[PDB]
């Protein structure tokens, strides 16, 4: 595979984000069989599986595109599920924990920026 440095970084980000989701709540697209009204509430479903697929096709051109999809995962869960639920709580935990990681990722895109030269 002919991997760009952004992709390598984003994969490390993405793996770390998944590491914080041990229950695999956001690992895969929501099932419509399991949630038939989902698209009444959510305009743009997103999950880590779909992000990895875009990543592995080197379909992120910048960190900003990656963060937008990560935000969707979080925001969709909070819009669909009540504050009272496990899905909502995990999403908050993952948002907080992943903020740390994405903030680290921004520093690192800048760091690589400095290496040249």
From Swiss-Prot:
Query: Where does the Bromo domain lie?
Result: 1-105
Glycyl lysine isopeptide (Lys-Gly) (interchain with G-Cter in SUMO2) cross-link site:
33
Q: Which domain of life is it from?
A: Eukaryota
Q: Subcellular localization, per the record?
A: Nucleus; Chromosome
Q: In which tissues is it expressed?
A: Highly expressed in testis.
Give the signal sequence positions.
none
Free-text function comment from the UniProt entry: Scaffold subunit of various histone acetyltransferase (HAT) complexes, such as the MOZ/MORF and HBO1 complexes, that acts as a regulator of hematopoiesis. Plays a key role in HBO1 complex by directing KAT7/HBO1 specificity towards histone H3 'Lys-14' acetylation (H3K14ac), thereby promoting erythroid differentiation.
Subunit architecture: Component of some HBO1 complex composed of KAT7/HBO1, MEAF6, ING4 and BRD1/BRPF2. Component of the MOZ/MORF complex composed at least of ING5, KAT6A, KAT6B, MEAF6 and one of BRPF1, BRD1/BRPF2 and BRPF3. Interacts (via PHD-type zinc finger domain) with unmodified histone H3. Interacts (via PWWP domain) with dimethylated and trimethylated 'Lys-79' on histone H3.
Please identify the protein, giving its name as recorded: Bromodomain-containing protein 1
* Protein's organism: Homo sapiens
